[PDB]
Amino acid sequence: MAINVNTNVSAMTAQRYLNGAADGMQKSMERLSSGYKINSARDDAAGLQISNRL
């Protein structure tokens, strides 16, 4: 490749996994506050239905 300033693709990978970590922490923070693995159908579409039926 070559050295450049216009692109920072290496930094783009660093920030891309930052959304992965921020999202991963965001789900966990919601789960600890409420105490429920299931707060929406996002985590388990099928698990939400059966838990509501129970």
Binding site: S28, R31, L32, G35, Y36, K37, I38, G47, S51, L54
Partner: peptide, 11 residues
């Protein structure tokens, strides 16, 4: 076992 969270796993 389906809805409730595991603190040992979530933390």
């Amino acid at each position: 076992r389906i809805r409730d969270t595991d603190y040992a796993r979530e933390t």
